[PDB]
Amino acid sequence: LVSDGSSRPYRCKIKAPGFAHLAGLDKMSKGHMLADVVAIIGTQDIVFGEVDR
Amino acid sequence: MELLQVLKRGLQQVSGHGGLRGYLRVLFRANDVRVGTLVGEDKYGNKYYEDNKQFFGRHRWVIYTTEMNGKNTFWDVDGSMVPPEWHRWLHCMT
Amino acid sequence: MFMINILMLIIPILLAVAFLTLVERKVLGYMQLRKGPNVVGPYGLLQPIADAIKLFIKEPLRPATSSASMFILAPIMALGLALTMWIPLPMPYPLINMNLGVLFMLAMSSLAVYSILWSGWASNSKYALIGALRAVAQTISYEVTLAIILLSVLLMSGSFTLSTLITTQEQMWLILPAWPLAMMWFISTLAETNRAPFDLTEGESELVSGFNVEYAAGPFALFFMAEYANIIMMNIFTAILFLGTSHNPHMPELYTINFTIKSLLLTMSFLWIRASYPRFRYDQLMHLLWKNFLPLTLALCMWHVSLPILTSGIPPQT
Amino acid sequence: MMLYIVFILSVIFVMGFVGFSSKPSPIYGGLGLIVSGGVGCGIVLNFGGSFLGLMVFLIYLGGMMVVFGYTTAMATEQYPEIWLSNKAVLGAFVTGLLMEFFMVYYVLKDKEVEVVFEFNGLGDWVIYDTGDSGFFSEEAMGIAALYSYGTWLVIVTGWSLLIGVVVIMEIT
Amino acid sequence: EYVVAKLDDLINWARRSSLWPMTFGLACCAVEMMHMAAPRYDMDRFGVVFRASPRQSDVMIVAGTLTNKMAPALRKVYDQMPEPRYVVSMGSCANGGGYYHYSYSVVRGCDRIVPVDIYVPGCPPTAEALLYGILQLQKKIKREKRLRIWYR
Amino acid sequence: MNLMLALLTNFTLATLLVIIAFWLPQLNVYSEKTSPYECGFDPMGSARLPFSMKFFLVAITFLLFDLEIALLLPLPWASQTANLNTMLTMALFLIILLAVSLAYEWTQKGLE
Amino acid sequence: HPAAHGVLRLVMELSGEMVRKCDPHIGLLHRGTEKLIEYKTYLQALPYFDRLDYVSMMCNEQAYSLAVEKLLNIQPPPRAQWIRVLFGEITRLLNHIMAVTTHALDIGAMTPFFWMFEEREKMFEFYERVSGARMHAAYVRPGGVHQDLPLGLMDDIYEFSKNFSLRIDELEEMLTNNRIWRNRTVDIGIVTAEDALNYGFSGVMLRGSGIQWDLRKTQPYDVYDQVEFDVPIGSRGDCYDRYLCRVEEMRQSIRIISQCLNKMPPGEI
Amino acid sequence: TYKYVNLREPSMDMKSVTDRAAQTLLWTELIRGLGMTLSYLFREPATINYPFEKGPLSPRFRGEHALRRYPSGEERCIACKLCEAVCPAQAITIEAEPRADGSRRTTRYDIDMTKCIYCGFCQEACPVDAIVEGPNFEFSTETHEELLYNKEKLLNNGDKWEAEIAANIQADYLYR
Ligand code: SF4
């Protein structure tokens, strides 16, 4: 949170997972089937609108 | 052993509730057929039974009857009908 | 009036397969803690007359990209081999008496999967294309688990007909003696007819919706009424091939009464599962058949062969 | 339901073939078989042989063909077609169909024409049975189970299959 | 003469009494849809069975926020549905867009993309004014298919 | 003579019921636009179906285990004989000729 | 259907069976946020932090309201914080009731959903009684909690907590050692590397993978220091040892909610 | 501190390994739970039978709007233009203009009911204590031409129940 010294802010930059836990799908899953990749995601707990990051 | 035990509440839930007439009629409105203990006064046609304080959240219930205000008869029941008092009662806000 | 004994069968059954769909979600309702279709009935028992009528009013699209000649002969089946298979099935008196007829089921158990391969191919691309291909592949590998473990017991009863199979289970409920097999007679029909724990054919999880995806309300009642015309039959079979009733040459009627109070318990098993278990990820799905289910089924066959011969037991038939 | 219910099957059978004996875009090839196989297992179920008929459904028509149909998605043709639509397929058809018809027309359309087609009478199934009999499982192929006398017939077939897989474990 | 208008106490009572709603999860509003099919307020078994495939549905439901890149997807899905179709938006973001209504990458309103029928108003509508919004749509079939064939 | 009366009865309800469902509203006066919007949720999909092998073998692999369990079928009729030893000694061969044919291939199923 | 209450489109080039490639397209929900929070004041722009995720509510804003009190050199009064542990550590009972279930609705089961959300309701009251609304509730602020809580809730928190460790014992006999599930997950998607750090992952898919670190006890928040808890850890880096944190991490919380009802001192808010 | 999970080794002795070979091959586990922990159906269902019974709430609940008035009515709103200026979503719209006597009041007051994000920022900025989020979820009409409200929709909607509202604040106002 930058702030410029007065009332309204300046960049407010939010980071939540979903730039990591899903940066690492492509890596993680190579070499297992397709019917795994549905059950890989569920463990990171990816929930979107958060990737509004 | 359990065939006549619980059964003695239901046969008194039927034969002592409206006989055959006042039973099938309160079942056809919904399957809520359990007869609460007490009653309530208000207001037009719509009672409030209230259970014995033996449940939480299904302990406080209501009954709709007929043609409140320029209304279709019965099988239309929505739930915006309750008088703007019971929102302080039926909703368990207080 | 032999033609009015038939049409008294086809009609009165289409009510069960209809009113199963209701007891579908009541029984599976109270597993969840809730009530089942309620508002419309009054009890709900009136739901399925309203549901049969919404589909055939609702417009039946065809894909612009389809081959219409196959998009008919295929479903014009999913309702035959489901309603033909019922024919020689004693309760107690079957409509037909087929000499070797037990074998005749496998004839009609084998010829339905050749109505899946048509439809999913008849239409179009990869959700019903390779998606109706690889439900072929599992459906034929659960026969070899089957015909053997059907053929086992038939060493223990003497022939291929069904009038003998009431005689031998007299006072012995044929489930004692082979109880190891009986298990595998169950997981088969549940794996073959595409039901809960091995669910893949009809899609929910692994894909969008398997094999049903294209048919709009118009044809899709048939399949949704076909797929439930197998499930209440294999399960109206198992209980003539295992849990036997006691024929009565006098009050035939008390045979069926006690007979539907079994086959109708038994069925309520594919509903009592579906609330419970998850799915198999198609590798594990066949990969558990050859390795695991099969070696036994051969081994037991080397056993029920000798057990009669080694006890002077040999059952009285040709 | 006359006495001709056999002759009416075969001439559907004989017409079962010529569908796929020309050139139909072989996803309809199957539908030239399972009719032919079906009516074929139809004819055999007369004459008293039964078990041996009801197997063709199980071992071949039911079981085999599906493999013939489980491929032709691997060899998959490009954009299939309704046969007899074309001018390439349709031309070859009829002349077959008429060739038995024009045969079947005056084969016997009259007293006799002439000799080679005249020594086959019709209509009572003159031969189709003999007398009466007793019963063994039926009489005929009711006893098709010989693990008695037949042995050197099995043990070749028993052994010839076991090699069926080894060959095919390789080239695959 | 009168048989028609008595017939529409069947067909106009059939289509209203069995609905096969699609849903769109997108944004916050999806969770207060789930709790309509959780056992408290029990959506199904009050006549409406929950999600099916795109082809078999009747009433699609829009939750959530509709950005640019989702519009080309919706429009297409709304089509394929059979005839007797409706569109019931919900949430303060299918009505003119919650907030984000001034953003750059949010379509403003989701009426603009399709002919929407019933509305519901607020971040999450309280899982109640949902069902209250349907017992509008089961009462919004008073219509008659008589008096098109049978007048003009 | 009453079997075929019990078959063509069955289809003719089914081959009826296609038209009274598929066809009847199919000529109804609703819109039914010809737009190429159909073939759901894989919009275009232009390819041949490629050969994928472990799809294939599970065809062949069965077809052969299938045969002999037609050969194996007439045991329960053959349990009634004169000399029976030529049965038990012989009957048990087919099975082990089946089970062997597993064990070999069992080194490689691949992903089946 | 497998969107997990969201809308992603991923594209894979699989090799005949195995995937070996994936490259998802996110950006379906963007909505244009951080361009719109330069245009709003500090207390006016709070909710757009609550509406970010759908599940954790008071745990967001605990991370904004702590990034403002700093620049102001100001701390809440003592009864402030000991709320923000009771709600702050009650919503860890939400995302761990969801990510064991609405994950395992993909695996296909039914009941472990229709069995739980009977209960995840009994919690949503406690957002409604305390302040207003069903889910998103704007309560925490730059100054500590908004307004005091009614006379009550401490016989509805206690009464509810001592019932709860049973429910979490109906997601155990129904899952852990049930085989068809054990086999759907073991040794699946294993990242054990020091890439599982190099990418800068956060908590679980860390702490369940070995490398041992957490930001609750290595840094204080708001009095978090004065209560005792143990951070479950995993054996091998697969999934089924990232599940097993999220059970033994719902059985730690009921320690703190039980430890934090005894200490709340009277004071302003 | 720490803990270590899934760190264990099998015992490897023939008193044990039967106990793990009486498990794989006899299914002695996997019938333990879902032979049982499933049934365990014999508990009373939990359902709020909806059209009639309804569930709990609290006096601080949020929902449909109102504008009160004192005893004999003043339209309690003074149009001080605040509940407008703290509004995150910017739903509110207010236009004052001096009423005939010279006391000021409103003319147009419009809460859009789609944009309103249900803060509880417009209940808490009004110093004269007019505008109040009601506790009734009555909603869901069939046309978006509607939910936009005018002034003279609100007042009624806030004089339809004031027996609901006027008895909540006097539970809640002692805290804040
Ligand atoms: S408020 Fe806007 S974002 Fe939050 S749920 Fe309702 S619509 Fe989705």
Ligand code: SF4
């Ligand atoms: S209520 Fe308070 S804020 Fe809303 S207008 Fe009247 S005075 Fe201004």
Ligand code: SF4
């Ligand atoms: S209710 Fe919430 S949104 Fe609507 S005005 Fe008051 S504060 Fe702004």
